Every structure is written in structure tokens, then in C-alpha cells.
Assembly symmetry: C3
Homo-oligomer: 228 residues x 3
């Protein structure tokens, strides 16, 4: 519970905060309208995560959930974070390939379902039911990955070269990191409990920083964000 994993929470807080400041300073030197959208979106991601990681570190974003026959510590603050940061990350990818509003809404909607059902599962009191919510959230995740490959990948190409390769790299990064979350949830304290909360927190911290700060570094350092 709220002790062993404090170091990963403090490290996560520090890393999200440092990334936010870096992106903020880096973006000061920005005039291009479109480059500005990418900077605004990308800087807000770590900023939000920073606040939620801090809430977990201080103990606010933690709650106890009874199930399986025990009082299980559940960090609900993660979902509040993801509810806002995941769609923003998807927005960066969509803006990059200039997706139509229809596909953007589909991605944002699918993302809301993924995080929402993930939260319902995290707080469910009936053990077996938790995995039903996990499956539904996982289906929503696969839909998103499908759109990113069969509804996006085919358009980045019909666009500028630099946009295509940058999108391809960010797309690959997203697919790899995002797919790891359901696995961590399944084996950790929220699911089967095969991995202790301490290790679970460490895993999510590494994934989060990479999916947010790592992702932002790649994106904000490319020329694909400027109007040619």
C-alpha cells in the first residue's frame, strides 16, 4: 500500500514535472500556428500527469477496494490522468496526419470507453467481474490501434514525407507502450495480483514517462510539426 512504492511515485512526479517545464521553455520559441498546437497539446500531457502523480505520492489519489476477500489499495488517480492524457496523445497523432473529424471523434470516444471501463474494473467489488471490464477496455484499445494502422497509417503517406516517417515512429511507440498497460493491470494489484503493487507502480511509471515525455521529445524535435 501507500509506502514501499513511494519512490516510483516521487520519481514519476519529478520526471513529469521536469518534462513539462522543458516543453514549456522549448515552446517559448514558437510562432508557427500549427507548431503551437503540437506544443500546447504535448506540454499539457505531462502537466496533467504531474498533478496526478503528486496526488498519488501524497496519498490523495489512493483508495481501498474490497474484493477477492481483501481490502485492496487502488490508485484511482491514474484513470483521472489517462482520461485526459490519452485522448490528447491521440490528438497529436491525428493532427500530424490531418485526420478528419469523424475519425478523431471515433478515437476520442473509443479512448473514453477504454479508460472509463478500466476505472469501473479497478473499483469493482466482485473479483471475476473485474476481468469482464478489463476485456471490454482491451477491446476498445484494439479498436484504437486498428484505426491507427488501417485508418491512419494509410493517410500519413498521402501526406508529406517527414509527416509520414514521424507518424510511423510515434505510431510504433504508441502501439508498443499502450499494449503493455493491460498486461500490467492484469498481473498487478488491480487484476490477478501476481505482481506486488510496488512493482506494479514501477512498471506504470516507466510506461507513463516514456509514453508522455519520451513521446513528446520525439514529436517536438521533428520538423513534421511545422507547416513546411
Amino acid at each position: 500500500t501507500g509506502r514501499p512504492e513511494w519512490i516510483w511515485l516521487a520519481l514519476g512526479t519529478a520526471l513529469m514535472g521536469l518534462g513539462t517545464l522543458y516543453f514549456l521553455v522549448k515552446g517559448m520559441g514558437v510562432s508557427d500556428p500549427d507548431a503551437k498546437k503540437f506544443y500546447a497539446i504535448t506540454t499539457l500531457v505531462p502537466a496533467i500527469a504531474f498533478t496526478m502523480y503528486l496526488s498519488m505520492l501524497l496519498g490523495y489519489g489512493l483508495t481501498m477496494v474490497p474484493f477477492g476477500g481483501e481490502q485492496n489499495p487502488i490508485y484511482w488517480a491514474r484513470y483521472a490522468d489517462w482520461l485526459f492524457t490519452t485522448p490528447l496523445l491521440l490528438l497529436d497523432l491525428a493532427l500530424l496526419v490531418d485526420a478528419d473529424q469523424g475519425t478523431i471523434l471515433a478515437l476520442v470516444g473509443a479512448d473514453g470507453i477504454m479508460i472509463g471501463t478500466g476505472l469501473v474494473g479497478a473499483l469493482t467489488k466482485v473479483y471475476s467481474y473485474r476481468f469482464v471490464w478489463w476485456a471490454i477496455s482491451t477491446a476498445a484499445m484494439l479498436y484504437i490501434l486498428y484505426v491507427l494502422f488501417f485508418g491512419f497509417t494509410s493517410k500519413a503517406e498521402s501526406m508529406r514525407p517527414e509527416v509520414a516517417s514521424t507518424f510511423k515512429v510515434l505510431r510504433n511507440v504508441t502501439v508498443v507502450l499502450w499494449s503493455a498497460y493491460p498486461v500490467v493491470w492484469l498481473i498487478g494489484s488491480e487484476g490477478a495480483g501476481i505482481v506486488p503493487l510496488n512493482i506494479e507502480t514501477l512498471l506504470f511509471m516507466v510506461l507513463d514517462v516514456s509514453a508522455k515525455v519520451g513521446f513528446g521529445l520525439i514529436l517536438l524535435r521533428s520538423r513534421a510539426i511545422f507547416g513546411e
Copy 2:
């Protein structure tokens, strides 16, 4: 409470899920940009309701509220559903007639107030106060219906013929079904308690499926969704 009405909840879950899959498959054959927006919006509606109906069926979206001198079972998951699905349904209607952003914001805002105040009323502990919230939510609903008739109906016409007639039918469907919700709430467990929760659940299930799946069928089967 959480037993007799299980069948309507299970039927609702199954019907929302089947509708979502149908719209998903049907939309695979879709290239037109605008047709895509209508499919994305319309498919997300049943998808969300599906998750909330399931949460109620499993018991997660149910809570007890003390008032009138009793512990009353209240399915709060309904509001979480409506908070997202009603504005999306309004968006389908607005896109159909190509409404201006000003009117869209007014409808979305009025809708948020309607659902939000409806939720406050559902959880209020002072019996008489529950109806004050019901009245305010009902006023917000009338505003929406007013805009749909005196701010929308007059524009669908100044547009394409097929757009006008389809909008007219969906407009009529909406007015009829939506107006029934406040009545059901008033006579059911949330309000006067003249109708038992069992029958109340049945009523909302029929209304929901019709307002979502029924509505989607009419819309997604018309040529009004394509750019001529």
C-alpha cells in the same frame, strides 16, 4: 432493488451491444468524410449505453439514497450514460442541418444542465427538493426542444430536401421519446414512487433502445448523411 429488474437490464445490455456491432460493421463500408462523422457519432452512442447498462446489470451503477424516510435504490449509471449520449444525439441532428457553432454550444450546454440537474435530483436527500431539480432539468429540456423546432427546423429546409425530411423525422422521434423521460422519472422510484423500480427500469430500457438504436437505424439508413 437489484433483482426483479435484472431482465430489463440484461435485455438492454444485449440490445445496445448488438446495435453497436451492427453500426460498426455497417460503417466499415464508408469512405465519405461526412458520412463518417455520422457513423462515428451514432455508433459511439450505443457503445456507451452498452457499458452503463452492463454496470447496472452487474450492480456497479446502483446506489442507495435516503429520502422520504427510506433507503431508495438509485441507478446513477444512467446519468453518466446520458451525460455523453444525449449531446452526441443532438450533434447528429445539428450536423444534419449544418447548424452554426453558436447553436451547437447552446444545445450541448443546455443538455449538460439537464442531465447534471437530473443527477442532483436523483441523489438529493430531501424529498421535496428532488422535484425542484426535476423542474429545472425539465426547463432545460424544453429549451432544447424549442431550439430544435424554432432554431433548427427552419434551417433544415433552407438546405437539401432529403436533409429536411430526414431531420424532420428524427426531430419528431426525439421530441416524442425525450419528453417521456421526465414523466417516467416523476412517477418512478426517483420521484413520486407511484411506479415500482421494476417497471421504471423497463420503461427507460424501451425508451433508451428506441432513442439510440432506433434513432441510429433511421439516420444511418438515409442518404441525407452523404455529401450529395
Copy 3:
């Protein structure tokens, strides 16, 4: 707690309700597309506050939070209000100067952090931690004010004259009123408790009505809202 301050809550409810109705009637005489956006945004602000002030008056939006060694009455309904009304007010300012989407997202995001962290601080059980959240929220507020002066003020000018002067006055009004909120929070029941809840409620009521109704009056009475 829920008694002495009832008059300020009732006065606030009445004033927000009267403002909403006034803006609603005033806006009936509106055809211009852009003028419509300003009316829709501006009327929704008092409408939302009206509902939240009423929830506080009736006792629904009030909760007890343990900290410092006492059971402290906290009106959480304020944050639900601000979560929606502050970004809408920022939207009025942004539309006025025709800001780019990038800056709009930055303002909305910064605003969400400001209100969200303010709420976390309001509900935090560890006294000293409450001020950590206050500081973070205050930093987010300063960012918003910075953008309004160094990212907005310089564009209203490169626009129409009437737009510039109206924006300047609304900008000034916002800076003055918004800066007062963190001060009131710090000295009131949410923070140091130097000022009693009764006086705290009075202060927020005066600020809210001015920042919403006062603000709306200035904006909706100017010609800057019309397309020349």
C-alpha cells in the same frame, strides 16, 4: 457551516438566475452567427453557476473535510461550477481576439489544472498539503494571465479597434477579479481559516456575480461581438 452564509447563497442564486434570464431574453434579438456564439457562451455561464449556487443553498454541494484537527465544511459545488464556467469565460475572450486553436487549448488545459488542483486542495486531509495544491493552482492561474497579456493583448490590436478596446476592458476585469479568488481561498475556511465561512461565502458571491454577470453585461452590450 450550512446556516449563517445562507443569505449570500440565496442572493447568489437569485442574481445568477436573473442574469441568465436577462441574457436569454436579450439574445432572442440575435441573427448574426458570431454574435450568437458570444450570447450562447455568455448565457451558459450564469446558468451553470445558478444551478451550483442553488445546490449549495439547499445543502447538496456541501461536504465535511477533516484536517488541521477539525471537521471543516467545504462547498465542493463551487469547483464543479468553475470547471465549466472559467473555460467558457476564457473562450469568450479568445473568440473576441480570434485566437488560434493552439492557444485556446493551452488556456482550457491550464484552466482545467487550476480548478482540478484547487479541488484536490479543498478536499485534502493533510493541512500543510492543502497549500501545495494552492500553489500549483496559482501557478496555473498566472500562466493564464500571462497568455492573456503576452499572447492575446498583442493580437486584439492587430484586429479591429472596437475588438481591441473591449478585449482590453474585459481582460482587465478578468485579471483583477480572478486574482482575488486565490487570496480568498487562502484566508478562508479552505486555507488558513483567518476569515469565517460566512464572510468567505460573501466574498466569492460578489466575485462570482461580477466575473459572470458583470462580465457578461460589458461584453453583450458592445459592438465588438458583431461581424462589423
